[PDB]
């Protein structure tokens, strides 16, 4: 029974630490893949690699052994690393969206004032926002009842912290991406729309195919993010406030938590393994 769970979770963690690593490496080797865009995709892989080697393994222990057998000090470290490293991962997707928006809407900026220093600033802000969510519980905003049981490693259920931490990690990022990617869709459609009759109908057909591509791509990007992390964050806003008469089945809890932790295996695929440039570099290396 626990053997089965161990094997399956072990596969998730293994595939993640492998996938993320390859993406980080390819950029460092091939000088083809060293532009401002690929730097932000690479820094997403680094953040997901840190999730896969620090957060995931200890969470798998807490799942198989169904108790915290590492001690109260290790418990606080896990909660703080979990919040910091997963707040960064969600906000890295907003950095990629913001960089993409500026390129489609301002062509002049793209040529001139788009710097590799822009990349650094965006990356630094993701980690800053991370610390600002994770530091509060560790010093303040913490009830003794939360750490009453040493057999459990649970986050602060303070109604105050619930709103602060749930909104400033998932809900605000969600709205930002929906708006930015919404405007990129508008801009795309505008450009797409704006013997010789054979050529004419080839043009009208290419337009229809490109319209389909701009729907599919946005579907994969926004879709993955929502179906992975949203199931988790609805529960993590309602349940704290509605204490009584809201028993989560133990099973459901585990499924939604690990569906979330599986975005660190799909983020490498959607952003790097799908684009042509990375694929080509991997063929050159191996």
């Amino acid at each position: 029974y626990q053997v089965i769970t161990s094997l399956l979770l072990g596969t998730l963690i293994f595939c993640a630490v492998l996938g993320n690593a390859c993406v980080v490496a390819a950029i460092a080797l091939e000088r083809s893949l060293q532009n401002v865009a690929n730097y932000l995709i690479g820094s997403l892989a680094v953040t997901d690699l840190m999730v896969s080697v620090l957060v995931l393994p200890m969470a798998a222990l807490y799942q198989v052994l169904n108790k915290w057998t590492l001690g109260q000090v290790t418990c606080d470290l896990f909660i703080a690393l979990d919040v910091l490293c997963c707040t960064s991962s969600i906000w890295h997707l907003c950095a990629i969206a913001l960089d993409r928006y500026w390129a489609i809407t301002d062509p002049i900026d793209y040529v001139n004032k788009r710097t590799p220093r822009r990349a650094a600033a965006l990356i630094s802000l993701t980690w800053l926002i991370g610390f600002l969510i994770s530091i509060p519980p560790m010093l303040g905003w913490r009830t003794p009842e939360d750490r009453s049981d040493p057999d459990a490693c649970t986050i602060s259920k303070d109604h105050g912290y619930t709103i602060y931490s749930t909104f400033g990690a998932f809900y605000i990022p969600l709205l930002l991406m929906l708006v930015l990617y919404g405007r990129i869709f508008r801009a795309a459609r505008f450009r797409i729309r704006k013997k010789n009759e054979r050529n004419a109908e080839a043009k009208r057909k290419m337009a229809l195919a490109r319209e389909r591509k701009t729907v599919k791509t946005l579907g994969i990007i926004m879709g993955t993010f929502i179906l992975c992390w949203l199931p988790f964050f609805i529960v993590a806003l309602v349940l704290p406030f509605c204490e009584s008469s809201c028993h989560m089945p133990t099973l459901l809890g585990a499924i939604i938590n690990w569906l979330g932790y599986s975005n660190s295996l799909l983020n490498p695929v959607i952003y790097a393994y799908f684009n042509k440039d990375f694929q080509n570099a991997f063929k050159k290396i191996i």
């Binding site: 002049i108 793209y110 990129i184 795309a188 450009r191 591509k213 791509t217």
Partner: protein, 215 residues
């Protein structure tokens, strides 16, 4: 461990490397364009509006620095120096509409086909500038268009005749990710440089859209 001389050698190397980088940053912010076409096509007029072998005219328009390379003075095989201009953002092509009667137009049509189909210029967009629109317009009245193109089955009116020559020019393009921007050159106004600007800004946006996967 390094001797005095070896250390000074490394210092010289590092100063050079610093300059080499600074010069590369400030040379990736220029939009490089290739001016092509026949000799007396109206390349001259376009050069003048923008201001032995290759002549470079650089200008700034709306916070965007352009560089336009003219190779009309290079009388040699095109193959052997056409690979050097693989990185150009667009190609500006000048055609003399009124020169068909004097065929000169047939020569221009052939050069156009070649530069559309070169392995180095498969996707490089072309901005076509059909010159001498007024001079064409007055002379078709007398000397017809059927002389240059027997297939022409349409009437000899300015709008219809000019549009025929344009559709015929756009037919040589047989590749996607490559658009042709035709424009009848508007007097001595700043409209001509605006057509280059709008075309360049459109091909920057299209390239970014393709990178994201949305084009």
């Amino acid at each position: 461990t390094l001797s005095a001389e070896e250390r000074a050698a490394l210092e010289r190397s590092k100063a050079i490397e610093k300059n080499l980088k600074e010069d590369g940053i400030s040379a990736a912010k220029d939009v490089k364009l290739l001016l092509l076409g026949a000799g007396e096509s109206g390349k001259s007029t376009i050069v003048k509006q923008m201001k032995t072998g290759i002549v470079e005219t650089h200008f700034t328009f709306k916070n965007l620095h352009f560089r336009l390379f003219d190779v009309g003075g290079q009388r040699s095989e095109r193959k052997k120096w056409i690979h050097c201009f693989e990185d150009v953002t667009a190609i500006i092509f000048c055609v003399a509409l009124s020169g068909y009667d004097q065929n000169r137009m047939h020569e221009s049509l052939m050069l156009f086909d070649s530069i559309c189909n070169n392995k180095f210029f498969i996707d490089t967009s072309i901005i076509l500038f059909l010159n001498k629109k007024d001079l064409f317009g007055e002379k078709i009245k007398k000397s017809p268009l059927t002389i240059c193109f027997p297939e022409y089955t349409g009437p000899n009116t300015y709008e219809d005749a000019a549009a025929y020559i344009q559709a015929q020019f756009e037919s040589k393009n047989r590749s996607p990710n490559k658009e042709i921007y035709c424009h009848m050159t508007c007097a001595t106004d700043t409209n001509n440089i605006q057509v280059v600007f709008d075309a360049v800004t459109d091909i920057i946006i299209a390239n970014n859209l393709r990178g994201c996967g949305l084009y």
